[PDB]
Symmetry: D3
């Protein structure tokens, strides 16, 4: 009776789920909660049940990239999840404004994947749910953590080559705030499946400035802590509606 | 020195602008305000300076369809508008839930135009400003007017032919709430020009059921009055910030 | 029951219709006819019954842009129109040859809209009826009015941004003569609905040279007069075969 | 020093060129002229100088299909041809109206090739020159040969498979008259190179009814001689202008 | 210092790399080697140095999906890998011929990802190196394991929805043998980076018949043993050239 | 009765067919055989039965370009051909490595045609049969003829214009070795029709350096002899498996 990739049962799926890319990040989140229960670890998908401020919700890793995260999101969305919040990292597309360590809460995303397009026509928007977005912003100000807001580029390409020009500069000029690899996919899947979604992200560098060393995948520790508390806060607040 | 199509000067543009498709609707709105100043009327573009709740904002008609409304929106965005709210009509894509005369406040749109695509790659989301969306919803709530929230399909096709299948049913299945013709264009132009946008829409029928007589372009009178009140309410609230 | 946007009845549609973008141009035209009858004015759609040289035909405004004019053209084509001639303005794409105030009679157009693509695959030509084209040229010759002939770019973008390159220069290199916003839409809708179409256009400037001040939307009055007489001449000649 | 595939020199190219697909057709045409001179025959490209009604023009075969005919057309257009008329065969897409052996003179074409798209954006129309079209029509009238006029589908696919549906029926519904494989390519190359083009075509069958035996590769003898006479007629009329 | 996601140094990269999607599979493979050294485990990327039949090559997991595996493959290809073989699972697209547990060695793949398209135009083939394909086939016959050969569909969609039809049936009709999620990405990256690639795959079910219960995540043990033996045999053969 | 374009019967079709672009090349090949029998010559399609090393196989010309050669390949594949090897010319895309007169044996091709796309989606690879490739290579080895292996660009454009950039440079950077016009079309049709295919090509120049005079379609005589002997050798070896 188990889900194919998450290897947990439908009965173990909570109304609220916090997803992250890195399985290691699940272990850092779970030790911040009041208690947890380890559930499964299959491939890159690590699932834990988090207990926080009297509420119960899953934390699950989805892996790097849209195709792999989509299998995670589908398994969640078709088996009872109502709210999914991604807490991720990102690169900055506004290096004058948004620096390594900064936190962005994103309402919408650029669909530079394939899987969303195999689900719905390209003209359809990757947009998060306002309530999820609103509660992430509200927790951040309650915790007195400055955050940015904007659009994320969700791109399937991490290492550009020099044949086809990358569109990242185009999107920067179009006022996209940040870039990562999974948010647009989450948003689209959630819209199609009537699941509310949201996204909060921590800058790990600037892809325009990698050749200058503007990169470190060791996330700024006090900001990673801040982001986590914001995410956990939002999840508990949203979970109360369904408990 | 007048704007090419609006035929008003740059100094006559206010921070907040309420836009509608029908130039006749501009006259319905202006008489509900505390007072107004008729500014110009050229082609389909009628501009009026509205005074409401101690605030000053333009109401400008943009005409039918994305290419013609983009001309209006560019003229506003490039000459000082900071917030643009579209108060339009729409068809229902959820005839079971959303009926003639109902009001939808939309946060995002399907880009079934061409202009947006001539401006930015298709993967980029047509999304409204979530703070405009919030204001609109809060005004509706304070006026005790039930509203729907959701994605609008903005389609350049009004009259389908029999050769190419229309994607309207696909988008209904994807959970799009309504269909009109301008919102996606406003949203994308706003995002590119750093202008906050939003959309409130009144249902005039259901396109899947036109052949049953489920259409009346005389908009339901008290609901149109309600939508206008909401739009005017939101405009004056937003205008206070730039005053 | 009236047509939804034209608000005239099926019985008021003549075999031949002259269409223009600007409702203010309907008044310029009707005034050089032997007589006329005002029919309706709804949104940007002004309809007038023109009497000229013993014939009867409508003059109707279609508004700015492909989506809004498609609504007009479909209401006409599905309710009796057999010949539609657009008398519009355009920009020059050949500034060394075609100058402000010149008249172009176009046989074909580039489909840079969306609505035609929602009707028929992009590979399909936007092409005018060759007899309508011939009639327009012949009337111009009888009136001793020099004209140009060639392809029009019908583009949904009037105000380009600086992210995606505009294709206007590519089309100029491909020998397109002029640029407007409605003609390809008319042509395609006409071909699909078995309605004969054509277009005559007066140059208002050159979009490659707008920043040199090569623009004035006050059309050169003696050339506007000339284009109207050519257009009216052609409508009456064509209307005789349906009278 | 010769053209690469035609194996004739630039000075052997005349202002007017008649092109056909089948090298065998070149020999059927040359025999009807007042006299001729064989020039070359390389690959599928046979070139003959025709003398007819006091004029001289080349007759050149282009072979089957857009990529190979484009080599021929580029070598003509870049080396002095001012006018190119394709006299070809075609399938009927309107079996009730256009029968085996009927003649169609086409003004435009559907671009279902690739080479035109490698030259100019898809939205660009494949359209013939009016004077060429007019001349072909007038010669048919003088010879009392009944003809049809319409749009040709130029498709790179002759034998459909069962995976991707053919667009022929779509185009039939869209009112395209006939189907062949070279005309759109000629038209686009001609427009780009400032060469006047046109097409006259003889029906050899109906692709919707091949399984019922509505196909003969042996062209109706008196209609072929009729089509050849119209084309030879038109080439001589047009050649007079450049002589 | 270290590769961003693999977390190993340039100097630890061997000429030959065996890649698998599942980190758990790396543990099953190292066990059958003569010996090994655990190198690193970060995210879904587990790396192990294999010692087999006198030769040294890496075994690295790439995770589920094109965008995630592309990160792995790029880090390998730009830091000295010369040969990469993917040893994965797949679904069958020819259920009448290729059944659960069967092994397929694939020469080419369908590019239903996004990342390959962000590197090179869609018309470019996803193809493996013939020598790698030959080696794999030669190793299978020597070990006496019957294998299938064919094209793999690499698709970013694992769980189809009901809006856009899946292309799997089309590709089955086109004679594609199997489906997985990464091979096309590997092939294209390798071609671009001058790295020889190949793929060997074990059938885990048939997506056409998942609702018939034709699926098991547990790959049949004696066939997984066989595949790994082939793969390990091939890697050692290929390693000898660069030693 | 006869195939429509080849004008031979189903019973004259052999299991193995050597195809060439130039009807002239069929005559060059047949006289190197032990004997032959002329079958048919219609349009650009010359057909000859070749007797070589105790085997019997067709040699058939397909003309220039993808649409015309698809006509040939479909007639062959649907009427009993099992193996088809193209022996063609090509231009070099690696002018510092691959020179005029060199021979390349290709395993895959870039699908820059239209017809393949009207048969199967663009994501599908144009790939040759790996046994045919192996046989061609082993024949060259045994005849001591040095060859290159690689991907060919199959392009419908021979003469680029200056509006849309040619992708040849992009494909050179992507490591494609040569350019011709028909190989991708053969490969895709073969895969769909379950016919083994392959390609051997002789370099006639470099398209990047045509303006330097780096081109001669008079193919280097001893290398053309070498290519033919390789081609004939492989056809005979492959024919033994069906005889
Ligand atoms: N595309 C992209 N994604 C990211 C991310 C976010 N995730 C980090 C991980 C790859 O390092 C993927 O799961 C996406 C951080 N920085 C960047 C960047 O510069 N680019
Ligand atoms: N596409 C579409 N738009 C609308 C609208 C909205 N506007 C009404 C006007 C056309 O009637 C355009 O400005 C769009 C109302 N109902 C519908 C519908 O059924 N369809
Ligand atoms: N796109 C475009 N259209 C026009 C037109 C034609 N119409 C004028 C009006 C916009 O001013 C639309 O209805 C299109 C004149 N000049 C130009 C130009 O420079 N560009
Ligand atoms: N596509 C297509 N072309 C044609 C043609 C025209 N030419 C005939 C020849 C293929 O037989 C090509 O040069 C195109 C006649 N009938 C048909 C048909 O049914 N289909
Ligand atoms: N798309 C797809 N992939 C696979 C695979 C191969 N991998 C298994 C894993 C998803 O379970 C991905 O890394 C791809 C096995 N079966 C199937 C299937 O039915 N479908
Ligand atoms: N596209 C292309 N094809 C070729 C060929 C191969 N064939 C030669 C003939 C046109 O010259 C077509 O059948 C393709 C040789 N050289 C070249 C080249 O430089 N370019
Ligand atoms: K309009
Ligand atoms: K040919
Ligand atoms: K992954």
């Amino acid at each position: 009776n188990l889900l194919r990739h998450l290897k947990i049962s439908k009965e173990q799926i909570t109304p609220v789920v916090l997803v992250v890319g890195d399985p290691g990040r699940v272990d850092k989140i779970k030790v911040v909660c009041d208690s947890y229960v380890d559930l499964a670890y299959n491939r890159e998908y690590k699932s834990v049940e988090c207990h926080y401020k009297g509420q119960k919700f899953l934390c699950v890793s989805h892996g790097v990239g849209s195709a792999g995260c989509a299998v995670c999101f589908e398994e969640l969305c078709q088996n009872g999840a109502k709210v999914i919040i991604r807490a991720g990292s990102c690169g900055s597309l506004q290096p004058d404004l948004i620096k390594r360590g900064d936190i962005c809460i994103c309402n919408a995303a650029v669909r530079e994947d394939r899987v969303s397009h195999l689900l719905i026509h390209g003209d359809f928007p990757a947009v998060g749910d306002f309530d999820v977005y609103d509660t992430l912003n509200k927790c951040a100000q309650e915790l007195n953590v400055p955050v940015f807001n904007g659009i994320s580029v969700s791109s399937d390409m991490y290492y550009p080559n020099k044949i086809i020009p990358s569109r990242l500069e185009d999107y920067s000029k179009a006022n996209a705030a940040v870039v990562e690899m999974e948010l647009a996919t989450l948003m689209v899947i959630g819209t199609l499946r009537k699941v509310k979604t949201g996204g909060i992200l921590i800058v790990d560098g600037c892809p325009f400035k990698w050749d200058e060393g503007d990169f470190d995948n060791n996330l700024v520790p006090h900001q990673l802590e801040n982001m986590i508390k914001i995410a956990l806060g939002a999840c508990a607040k949203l979970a109360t509606k369904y408990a």
